[PDB]
């Protein structure tokens, strides 16, 4: 009709307007979340890089030390060689037990 | 009257345009946040998985130092000199070396 | 934005307009009746105007004839008497408003 | 439901406009006409009155004249009475032809 159509238009307006509102807040939350996520992302990236360097360094040092020991072993007594062989053998034996054990020692 | 209906129609176009644009931008934002959440997760478990190996290598290193230091006084006086210098040579890493290894590992 | 203050404007103006259309319609609808009354009264008074005209001319001519008669047959009578009749004729052709009022009042109250 | 309703409003508003316009027209024309009929009504009312008066006058005069003619009838000749009675009977008798004729005369006269 005519007086019932004019109310229909305003009703539709209030509804649509509400939609734009909720959408706006919802998108604001997306700005916040995306930003925070970005911060954390870059953070753990830098972590990955910096730790990768260290890991590589320690691997290298270890390799070197093993070279020294392996090339300095024959310059020893037989009874010694028999011992340092297994000593080196277990020095390269590292388990998650010891691992997390010293992890907590590091964090505390 | 007729100059007032067009206010309704035009303002409506204005509003729906706004809502449409905001919808588009918002969907783009969902895609973005989800994508960098994926990236974040990836680099998180990167951090963890690398940290494990790092501490592992550190521990191996300390142990090796222990042996090569405790089997050093059972060594020769002219030899202990060589081995000590060698130990202090091994625990010494400059950026050039690590660079040279990084390049070597990614090909 | 003033979309809600604009939406009710057209409502107000609408019912305003249709109110005017209503009032105008009843006014015109009455105007038809009044007009038909004017017309009817007109045809009545026209018809009666004509019908009365015929009678007026008739009685005019009758009176004329009768005066012609009385004057023409005036000298064919007594000498002392024609001077009386000659006066009766004068007072006859003289009609006063009082007499009129009398005749009308007689004519319309015998109509009841 | 929006772009199909706005045009509906505009359309029916134009409709209403047209309606009121036609009505306004008929109203004006009815004012003019009703005045035209009221005027005629007045004119022929005044005419009715003005003719009524004169008719009544003539009828009264005729009545009196008949009275006189009846009164002096016995004072005339016995041979004449039988003529003047007939004369009066002919006078108070008007046919539509005489009406027609004299109306014609009074008209083409002035």
From Swiss-Prot, chain B:
Post-translational modification: Phosphorylated, probably by CDK1. The degree of phosphorylation varies throughout the cell cycle, and is highest at the G2/M transition. Becomes hyperphosphorylated in response to cell differentiation and interaction with HES1 or RUNX1. Ubiquitinated by XIAP/BIRC4.
Subunit structure: Homooligomer and heterooligomer with other family members. Binds RUNX1, RUNX3, FOXA2, KDM6A, UTY, histone H3, HESX1, ESRRG and the NF-kappa-B subunit RELA. Interacts with HES1 (via WRPW motif). Binds TCF7, LEF1, TCF7L1 and TCF7L2. Interacts with SIX3. Interacts with EFNB1. Interacts with TLE4. Interacts with FOXG1/BF-1; the interaction is inhibited by TLE6/GRG6.
Tissue specificity annotation: In all tissues examined, mostly in brain, liver and muscle.
Name assigned to this protein: Transducin-like enhancer protein 1
Similarity annotation: Belongs to the WD repeat Groucho/TLE family.
Chain residue ranges for the region called Q domain: 1-107
Domain commentary: WD repeat Groucho/TLE family members are characterized by 5 regions, a glutamine-rich Q domain, a glycine/proline-rich GP domain, a central CcN domain, containing a nuclear localization signal, and a serine/proline-rich SP domain. The most highly conserved are the N-terminal Q domain and the C-terminal WD-repeat domain.
Cellular localization per UniProt: Nucleus
Function: Transcriptional corepressor that binds to a number of transcription factors. Inhibits NF-kappa-B-regulated gene expression. Inhibits the transcriptional activation mediated by FOXA2, and by CTNNB1 and TCF family members in Wnt signaling. Enhances FOXG1/BF-1- and HES1-mediated transcriptional repression. The effects of full-length TLE family members may be modulated by association with dominant-negative AES. Unusual function as coactivator for ESRRG.
Top-rank taxon: Eukaryota
């Amino acid at each position: 009709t005519i007086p019932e159509s004019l109310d229909r238009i305003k009703e539709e307006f209030q509804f649509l307007q509400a939609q734009y509102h909720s959408l706006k807040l919802e998108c604001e939350k997306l700005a916040s979340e995306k930003t925070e996520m970005q911060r954390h992302y870059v953070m753990y990236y830098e972590m990955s890089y910096g730790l990768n360097i260290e890991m590589h360094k320690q691997t290298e040092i270890a390799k070197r030390l093993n070279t020294i020991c392996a090339q300095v072993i024959p310059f020893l007594s037989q009874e010694h060689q028999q011992q340092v062989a297994q000593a080196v053998e277990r020095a390269k034996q590292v388990t998650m037990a010891e691992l997390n054990a010293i992890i907590g020692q590091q964090q505390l």
